[PDB]
Scaffold this active site. Structure first.
Site, PDB file in Angstrom:
ATOM      1  N   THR A 147       0.760  -1.124  -0.012  1.00 34.15           N
ATOM      2  CA  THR A 147       0.093   0.047  -0.133  1.00 34.15           C
ATOM      3  C   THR A 147       1.035   1.217  -0.012  1.00 34.15           C
ATOM      4  O   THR A 147       1.972   1.057   0.073  1.00 34.15           O
ATOM      5  CB  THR A 147      -0.983   0.102   1.175  1.00 34.15           C
ATOM      6  OG1 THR A 147      -1.750   1.189   0.988  1.00 34.15           O
ATOM      7  CG2 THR A 147      -0.214  -0.121   2.448  1.00 34.15           C
ATOM      8  N   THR A 148       0.339   2.401  -0.302  1.00 40.65           N
ATOM      9  CA  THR A 148       0.914   3.625  -0.096  1.00 40.65           C
ATOM     10  C   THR A 148      -0.084   4.883   0.008  1.00 40.65           C
ATOM     11  O   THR A 148      -1.244   4.651  -0.308  1.00 40.65           O
ATOM     12  CB  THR A 148       1.749   3.855  -1.581  1.00 40.65           C
ATOM     13  OG1 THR A 148       2.221   5.347  -1.385  1.00 40.65           O
ATOM     14  CG2 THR A 148       0.817   4.054  -2.678  1.00 40.65           C
TER      15      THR A 148
END
EC number: 3.4.25.1
Lengths: 203, 227, 227, 227, 203, 203, 227, 227, 203
Positions: free
Chosen positions: A1-2
């Site tokens: 994720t980011t």
């Protein structure tokens, strides 16, 4: 994720990818990691999914109860202090999460909180698996003299770099700009696709 | 006799202690609530004790969230403890279920808290009645709750001193599905019908919600337009 | 004397506090229940306090699950706390055993909750009687439960103010294994025999269940066909 | 005076509250039990309050297992709580030891539960007497237990309203080791000697066991053969 | 094991295999993994058997108590939030299960919940041992413009692919379509055998 | 150890071996693993001895208390649900046992329960060390059109195969047929030896 | 009668025990507080019991932190326990949230502590009223709190014996947004209007804050300049 | 009336139970304390009940450590329990903080212990007043504490029977910063001014400390030099 | 990280770097590790971030409550004893931190506290990752006959050596001098840059 959060002149822009896995095996091509936590502040999620959704429910509840009891919004230092005390009251049955809460009260802020509850301010921050890439491009291109449009273009270029160079991130980017004038406004997907096709990042 | 303890029934099976707590309600200011077309409103009188009091402070309409609101009458300290218990209970239901689907169980949790003290020795009842008003997934709901714990859902009601008079006026004049302006005008006329003439209505509080919207407090000028 | 505490017997060994709680039952509305051919029904009168009350709201027949239902009389706040305790207890038995095989132990858990407060100091009894009706794996069951906790299974009964009259008419007129329409007609005639003539029966609630089916609340028109 | 609390002795060292709870027992129906040749039986009268009551329901002889049974008199809600406590206690002894070897300790656990509430303030006693009858590894046992907790093992006894009369007739007529039919005939004659003549004995309950067998309720016709 | 849930136009189709093992050693050739949890929503099971049956009993109880107290059905977001809070209140004596709850309230939904209680929406989802196969065929053939018949044909083709290419799945497929009009209807085994013999998947 | 339970037309046949070890070292050539749990249902044991005997004592107690309070027997689904909740309330100080409870209420049933409390129905089941052998012969010879005599012959052939091909099983087989008409009847050892000598399994 | 227990309502629904605790407030020294332009102040009289007392000791203005302060009246032991509970509660809110954003919930926690003892048996109320004054992120706040627990936010108030005088003079003379010197002069004149003439005002305590600054006690000479 | 329970306010808001505990203080021996130049002292009379009593035993000046001391008056058993609670509290503060920096919170912990029993039912107040004297990092401190829990810091005071007289003489005669010999001479003259003449002062206890030193009890001869 | 505290004639100088990592991955180029804990004493942080910020919140609260209840500041021995008892009441769910609290009451002090709560005085102390370097230069150059200006020059030379020779430290140095006359005064960044450019440490 980011995740990514940027404080600029009188605004704060927070955006995430939307791809949830939950396995290796990417499973949900459209999740939700950008949460409005109060009418002038939002929260982004970069950890274990269930624990973080419990955290979002609790913080929505506590800040709404706060606004009701006091007839004013909570400051950003107060919500990060609250969130840090919550994560640090239990760290031996811990929450494996990296929270990032941004918002504006009289000046814009974006605060980062690790799994141990170390709240710390920074003018731009990022969490998640594909986080060093957006730290690279925000180290190279970010200036604090930007507008809102240059800021959201920088954010989309960042998350596009992270989607190109990382397995865990991906999916359709969603962005929300929170400012004092218009409040918390999440951009529709049509404008996001417009900026993607304009900046030459579509493939 | 059968009189000075909460845990003692009368030979007719009454709790005079509870009904005395109900007599505590009749000393408060009159408030009313009514359903209208896709919505619900609350109106409340206020004692203005002096000119040194803050207006923009402790108010008889209290929000429980953005989708439940409430008015009280009776002992004001008990009433504030009640409204805060209702707020905490609403937020607990939101943590557990993600949303509040029925206002009725929020009212039920508050009323079970009130019923619990009409039973155990060493506590007194709560000398407060409440009216809850809001939108849930069923529609507009409107309740009252009393020191016994009895819950009733209504089209329209009052609580407080002038309650009977207001109810009687609504017993002649209330119609369903009025537009919001007509419903507030009916409510202001109802509240005026409870005063003793010569005495005139100073600026009351009015809140209202329609389906699909959030909460809305009339400010004082918009209230002045109906006086 | 022997009079103002739950924990004190009389010289004849009576608890006047419990019987006073039984006097609370007699001020409620009359409800009845009766068995018929492969089924059981409940009928209940209602006080209609005003025209401003919601009809489609707090109802004297309450479902305990899709195979147990109940009516109450007495203190209405206590009665609602009891119906919610019965619902939670039924769902606990469904967690533990996968189904409800005997209604009688649901009644027993409610009645033990009621009996526990006729014994310990600092609590009062529950001034409510209940009638349970439903289908289980034995057949159609029909019970009442009282402030003492006493459980009885019947063919037919009433609770409330007109109880005696409704019993006495059934003491002349009840027959087993009636078809459902005849059984409801007998019940409506029984409820009319408790009124004081001149006073006429407004629209009552009726529920009924047959073996192999879930519940079935009559709407108001299907009730009007029998008035 | 020395009168209205369980924890207060008299100047003669009596607990009037306990003896009042014993006066509660005398308002119940008469039941008896007696030993016979390799066995023991129980007989019980019943109030038939109306014709609308279920016959085949709440019965004065209750099984505690397949090898202990009991009858009660007094407060019926207390009596049902007692019989269920006795059932749970018997099953606990069966978990711990694999079997019930002496009925006397089951009676002792029930009687210690009853004695515990003749001592602590804030509870009342149990207004119930019980008779336990069964087979254990010693033989046929027959007990009574009272609101004080006093246990007695007998050849034959009664509890209830006509107890004295039923005792006095047994005080003239009981012999050991009768065959079962003669023992039941003696019991029916004993129960008839407590009525006030003109009033006649409707169908009573009778249970019995012999050594090496299980439990055995007479149905109503087998009872009719002795009336 | 394998489960599948598909949201289409105004309906949601959920189907499972029926083979329970409980050992390596397939032991029960006809189990039950598709549970009706309320009159308009159902739940599928893909984990440890005992824990999941306890979960089904609890959710049947809580939703029936809910419908009784409120005279209306529970929304799907509410039941997934409830189920997530239940699984996440205890995760250090955890439930090893992958739940999938579908149903219709005003719009069809099918939500996936992992063992940590991360509720997330998707238009089609699958759990269990033979889950990537049905994700493959639902990635290749699923369109949201389907009817109910094309949907249930797609579902049977999916679970047939998973039965062909996986050891843990198998046994007779059972399918239930839940729609707003006819409610929750589980297809009889005769129609399921009819669709198997029609689609050319029988062997 | 080995157990076997068969549901046929209106009856259920449950049989065990009797050899308890408790060590490697077979120690008791005549144990007891077939327990009558109520007047129309029985229970078989295939795990750790002490824990399982505690389970049998508890279930005898609870079902007898049930029959006393309700004047009717407990259904088989209810006793398996009860037993599953009992085993699953404690699984981190767990019972290492494999229970198999059969009986008749209005239709015959035999339910299997693992150590985690996964209750599941099947028309025939088996547990224990020498269980795959009797699953083999019951897969090859069992038909649901059998009588009681053909059923008990099948059961004795099964447990004879398991005694021949397994170390942990052995000892004298004991069988009990539970039917609605005659209730629960355990066959005497003379008829069991008669069927062993008739079927040509004696050595 | 309805008189000697905290848990007993009157037949008019009053708690005389709480109002008797409110009568304890009237025996204390008069203190006042008022808002002015960007700030708020507190003024308090003192009983000087003897000349042997320390002046520079137990003072009627107490700091709750550097951004909340308070004055009390009533039973001084209860008042000191209250001020220490308020200090601990303020520091708990600072640990949890990093800062105190609204004084109102510090007042609410103190008032809920006071309300809790108007309800449960075996405790007495707190015979103390308090005034809280300070700066938060909303602005200058000024409260009072009473033995019932009732919270009020004001422009200006008094507590103590001369309260009704000091309010009444402010009911003629108070204006918003005064400069600080004028506001203190108005307060000293208000405090002098409560004395009985002949009796003269010895040196009182005065505290005050403006927005963006910390706390500021006048020493005695700066007070003497206004006498 | 308002009289026989600690938890009952009077209609004027008084606790007569606490003031009766204050009347218990007046039956003890007179003790005094006073500050002087860089130091503080305590003087105490004693009842010498007989000649068989030990002199060098239970003494009215008690050390709380090497840097806090105390005298008591009232019920002697309560006073001993109080001095031991003060010693344990002082040692707890020394464990937590390494040193005792303010005596005032040691006094506050003792006084909160005393206030806690003027509030909860089922306990009585402590019928003791105390005087604390010592050096801390602020300077010489001198306190008294009373059955209500009220703390006062003084230049000089008494407790006990002759308290008023010893106050009034100090109300004429006390000066700050006396040398130690003059301060003790003033104290002995003060203690003599409370006796009823003819009655003469036998040997009293005197303790004192100066800043930077430890504790110092006068022996009896050094006391005799001032008589 | 690195901290430094120096007691000299009538003053105590405490300075830190500002770089927080929280990962390997230096994440925050401007943190906050120098906290004013009371109007005449301060505290520096050299451990896990979240635990140490909780410690700073608690000590601010306790010392402010102390100053309020007693109308005088707390001594430095008392605050170190309090902090040691706090860290040593829980050492099996321990705080991984190295605290350093300095201040002046009637004589300047700087006390060091380890993770086990061993309070010990020294005339100069340092904690953190880049601590042995500043112990080296303070062993070579420090004299107790310094002024305040020579002291703060020594401190900046120390932290400059630690920034040059260590990875974990870095960022802009912040210094606060606490003396009895002017109280606690933190130097602005302009004077710090002035001393850096004057001492020939800028690059």
């Amino acid at each position: 994720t980011t995740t990514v959060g940027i404080t600029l002149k009188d605004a704060v822009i927070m955006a995430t990818e939307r791809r949830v896995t939950m396995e290796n095996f990417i499973m949900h091509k459209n999740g939700k990691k950008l949460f409005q936590i109060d009418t002038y502040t939002g929260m982004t999620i970069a950890g274990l999914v269930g624990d973080a959704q419990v955290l979002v429910r609790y913080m929505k509840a506590e800040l709404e109860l706060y606004r009701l009891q006091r007839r004013v919004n909570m400051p950003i230092e107060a919500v990060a202090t609250l969130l840090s005390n919550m994560l640090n009251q239990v760290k031996y049955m811990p929450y494996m999460v990296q929270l990032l809460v941004g918002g504006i009260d009289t000046a814009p802020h974006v605060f980062s909180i690790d799994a141990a509850g170390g709240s710390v301010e920074d003018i731009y921050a990022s969490t998640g698996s594909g986080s060093p890439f957006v730290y690279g491009v925000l180290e190279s291109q970010y200036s604090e003299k930007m507008t809102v449009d240059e800021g959201v273009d920088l954010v989309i270029r960042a998350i596009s770099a992270a989607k190109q160079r990382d397995s865990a991130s991906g999916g359709m980017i969603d962005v929300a700009v929170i400012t004092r004038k218009d409040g918390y406004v999440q951009l529709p997907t049509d404008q996001i696709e417009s900026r993607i096709r304009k900046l030459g990042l579509i493939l | 006799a059968y009189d000075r303890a909460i845990t003692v029934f009368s030979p007719d099976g009454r709790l005079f202690q509870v009904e005395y707590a109900r007599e505590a309600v009749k000393k408060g200011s009159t408030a009313l609530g009514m359903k209208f077309a896709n919505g619900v409103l609350l109106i409340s009188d206020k004692k203005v004790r002096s000119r040194l009091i803050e207006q923009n402070s402790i108010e008889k309409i209290q929000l429980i969230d953005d989708y439940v609101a409430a008015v009280t009458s009776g002992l004001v300290a008990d009433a504030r403890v009640l409204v805060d218990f209702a707020r905490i209970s609403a937020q607990q239901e939101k943590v557990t279920y993600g949303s509040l689907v029925n206002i009725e169980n929020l009212v039920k949790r508050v009323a079970d808290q009130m019923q619990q003290y009409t039973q155990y020795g060493g506590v007194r009842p709560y000398g407060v009645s409440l009216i809850f008003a809001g939108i849930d997934q069923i529609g507009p709901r409107l309740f009252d709750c009393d020191p016994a714990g009895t819950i009733n859902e209504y089209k329209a009601t009052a609580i407080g001193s002038g309650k009977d008079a207001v109810v009687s006026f609504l017993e002649r004049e209330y119609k369903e599905n009025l537009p919001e302006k007509e419903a507030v005008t009916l409510g202001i006329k109802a509240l005026k019908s409870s005063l003793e003439e010569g005495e005139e209505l100073k600026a009351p509080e009015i809140a209202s919600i329609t389906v699909g919207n959030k909460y809305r407090i009339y400010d004082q000028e918009e209230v002045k337009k109906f006086l």
